[PDB]
Amino acid sequence: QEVEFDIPPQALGSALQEFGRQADIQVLYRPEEVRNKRSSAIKGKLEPNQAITELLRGTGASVDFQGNAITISVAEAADSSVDLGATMITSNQLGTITEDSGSYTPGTIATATRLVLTPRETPQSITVVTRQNMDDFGLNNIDDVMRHTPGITVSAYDTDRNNYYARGFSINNFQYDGIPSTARNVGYSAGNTLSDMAIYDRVEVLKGATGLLTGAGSLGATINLIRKKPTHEFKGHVELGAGSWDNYRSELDVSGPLTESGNVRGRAVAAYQDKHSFMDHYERKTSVYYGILEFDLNPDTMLTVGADYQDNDPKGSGWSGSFPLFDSQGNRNDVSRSFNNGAKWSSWEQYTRTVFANLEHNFANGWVGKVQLDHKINGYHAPLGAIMGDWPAPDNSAKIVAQKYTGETKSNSLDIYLTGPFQFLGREHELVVGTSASFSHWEGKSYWNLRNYDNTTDDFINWDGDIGKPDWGTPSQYIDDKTRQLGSYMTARFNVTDDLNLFLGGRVVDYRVTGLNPTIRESGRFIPYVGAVYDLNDTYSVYASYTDIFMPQDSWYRDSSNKLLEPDEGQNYEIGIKGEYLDGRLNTSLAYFEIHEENRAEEDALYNSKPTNPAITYAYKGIKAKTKGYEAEISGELAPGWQVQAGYTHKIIRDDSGKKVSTWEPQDQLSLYTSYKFKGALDKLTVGGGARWQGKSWQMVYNNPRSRWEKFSQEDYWLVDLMARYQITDKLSASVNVNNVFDKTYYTNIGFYTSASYGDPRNLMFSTRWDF
Ligand SMILES: CCCCCCCCOCCOCCOCCOCCOCCO
Ligand SMILES: CCCCCCCCOCCOCCOCCOCCOCCO
């Protein structure tokens, strides 16, 4: 619909870059094709497709409309066969925005290499949860989104922290607009498990080994969250929602030009949610604010400054799971799903805020440069108190453990990169070169010396959280931890033939961890990157990649000799086929992958059964482990009103001995989510449902009162979701979500400190959205 335009005649390149900007649309185009071509003047209020055909008059070019993207091409009478993976330069460095796309499949994406590429072009497993998916299914935070992510298993630590698995591993890499955060441990990463979705366009998850742009981090995956950006036309909405257990949410999102010319633009969002829960005496208030402003210093240089903020604030938090597995005498414990071992006053409140600036420049090259500046705070305030141990006892009494952690982490980042195309042996390739620097500083206080507390409670079966609050006494410990990451990376994408694209690059990395432990250094570590994509027909391509990552170990992962273990590394080997249909409106992939891990910290039983060095009382051993598995997924349009996203993943991970590890992540999983928009008489009704299935999962846990190990099993289970929206009016709509339709009662944790958490019972959410 109609937009304000001002692009005067220039290099086709600038014109195109300037166009994507002015129109809020990603423009893809081939450097060698637009070289030495000229745009025609365009001036004023016009629809974006009249505008672009006017712009290209003279140039001999054609436009392919594809949702939030246009690709531009210049056909010849010649053409000796087609280069589907031709080097394309893009106008939006983070890829195609998903908001308003109507789709559950993404557009282009730079998650793997910083190069803007399509899921077909990307030689790695890349799953995206798109803005619309989030809207239809009510996914309001990162916990909701992960639960709907193909290939991801979400399990509980406690009411205020979950765990995310891919391919054998706990995910511990998070980025924001492509900037890695520091996530070493939970001090550094307060609120990462809790980010509200209000401020994001999409969440994009790279599976495998992602050292190339994460730098130091875990195996499994990266989770990359893209912030919502401001726009050239005014728009926004208000949303109010109401669900099971006194769950009320509201949300305001406003976007547009702040000056008559359009050269300064803004976007602002606020969202507030106060909820109780099926679990007894647990409530949680969350608040978020976000502001970003964009300044055009001139048509090819943009300055962006922004801030965001989220406060997660519960009552009735627990330390570890919702209740203890065994009682005092060693019998399995059996409780209601409402049972909550946390105390009334108990809280794991977690906060986060960012201030950021970026500057981005288009070189008259076709090259583009970008500087990214970040100040992040991850903070927490955690007076935890919760029933813990082998309780109840024969007389129905129980004991509380109560400790208090408060603290803050402040992080600063610089990220700078150059991206452009270049000719080598008569053909067009592209390159990213970039360097990065991060400094983050965790500080905190711990309280465990309680003064004159009586931690028994007389009644377990009817626990209510209604116990007194202790005197924390004086700080037991002072934390001070500084991490410093310096990175340098270079990926090159060579168009070798019309069907074959070769990827060659890597990162060089320097990582120093400093503070109250002995210094942990790693100078000059190289992380390689090898990939190739071979096109088979207009539909299918095959691909292969070899990818790496490592994480220098926590300071207490030492050995026999009191030496820190060499860093936990892994390599992903992946071969696959990916298929693209309806001009990129539908994507399919089947992959086979293998993860080789080396130096995975293992216990060391023989030593630990009777230590011989008081400096390490619990030494480890650095071992090896293997993931073998395969994954299939599909997303996009199955038919005109009909969208899906679905996947299927199979895995087993062992260590070189042979034992199955991460046995709680299931060996087989399946997700399918779908909605359908009726046409004709019912064209204002959208209907939707979904299912998630997973196979057996187990833990080995020690029954201390009976001095024997036990196996705990969660039998495979289905969860079914349902959904309907009705657009009553141009500007107002009403929705309902029903989750866990058949009220399946299942577990999300067994064995985490000898405890258990139930997943959500059936729940509903009502809401109205109002678009101005
Ligand atoms: C040192 C920290 C920097 C803080 C940066 C925070 C940025 C906050 O800015 C708020 C911007 O909100 C823009 C909202 O856009 C509203 C668009 O409508 C404009 C009014 O409409 C004009 C008449 O239709
Ligand atoms: C353990 C028990 C769980 C409860 C299960 C109940 C499931 C019942 O599902 C029925 C849902 O249908 C209700 C239809 O209500 C209409 C929605 O209208 C929205 C109003 O919008 C306001 C506009 O301003």
Curated annotation (Swiss-Prot):
Keyword Endoplasmic reticulum: no
Keyword Transmembrane: yes
Pfam families xref list: Plug, STN, TonB_dep_Rec_b-barrel
Membrane topology annotation: Multi-pass membrane protein
Induction, as annotated: By the siderophore, pyoverdine, and under iron starvation conditions.
Residue intervals of the TBDR plug domain: 118-228
Annotated compartments: Cell outer membrane
Described purpose of this protein according to its UniProt entry: Receptor for the siderophore ferripyoverdine.
Protein name in UniProt: Ferripyoverdine receptor
Organism in which the protein naturally occurs: Pseudomonas aeruginosa (strain ATCC 15692 / DSM 22644 / CIP 104116 / JCM 14847 / LMG 12228 / 1C / PRS 101 / PAO1)
